[PDB]
Design a protein around this ligand. Structure first.
Ligand code: HEM
Ligand code: CYN
Length: 161
């Protein structure tokens, strides 16, 4: 069933829901609700989909979809499409410390950003993920629209039954 390469990341599999917040120098701060699904099809990658919506009115905000590849155990390539007209490849590493997994990725570690002609200018994205039992937390830093690399997002999600 599960590819041997994915064994360390098996706790990621399933549905996650929670809430986060974000900011950037060029915008007003915001909050969001988030739903994530990790799945697989028997190969050395997870499938991944995210949908976010406004806490106030449940209006859809951001989504993202793609794949978490294991480039040999310990190595990850996160490959994503964004509905804002942007593609992202983040590269990095993970550690297992008992029930804690830590993933550290960046477009800056031989990753990629692609921009559609009508997209906003994003030039780097960094992601830090922590899975501690039934809790998934992350921060995302962004270099974009004239601003240095800095926080855009962070959230805390919980495993769904
Ligand atoms: C949970 C995921 C995310 C949420 C809820 C979110 C939410 C928002 C919101 C509400 C804004 C301000 C309103 C707007 O410009 O549409 C914004 C701006 C922005 N976001 Fe995000 N975002 C998320 C992820 C991302 C990702 C992954 C990227 C890059 C791929 C990104 C890039 C930007 C940029 C470039 C801006 C515009 C800044 C400007 O116009 O100066 N966001 N985000
Ligand atoms: C982010 N839109």
């Amino acid at each position: 069933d599960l590819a041997p390469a994915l064994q360390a990341l098996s706790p990621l599999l399933g549905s996650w829901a929670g809430r986060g917040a974000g900011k950037y120098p060029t915008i007003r701060p915001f909050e969001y609700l988030e739903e994530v699904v990790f799945a697989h099809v028997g190969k050395p990658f997870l499938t991944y989909t995210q949908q976010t919506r406004a806490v106030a009115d449940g209006k859809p905000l951001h989504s993202e979809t793609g794949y978490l590849r294991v480039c040999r155990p310990g190595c990850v390539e996160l490959v994503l499409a964004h509905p804002s007209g942007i593609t992202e490849i983040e590269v990095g590493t993970y550690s297992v410390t008992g029930d804690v997994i830590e993933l550290e990725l960046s477009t800056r570690a031989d990753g990629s950003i692609g921009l559609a002609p009508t997209a906003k200018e994003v030039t780097a994205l960094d992601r830090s993920y922590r899975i501690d039992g039934d809790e998934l937390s992350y921060s995302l830093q962004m270099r974009a629209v004239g601003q240095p690399l800095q926080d855009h997002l962070a959230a805390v999600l919980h495993r769904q039954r």
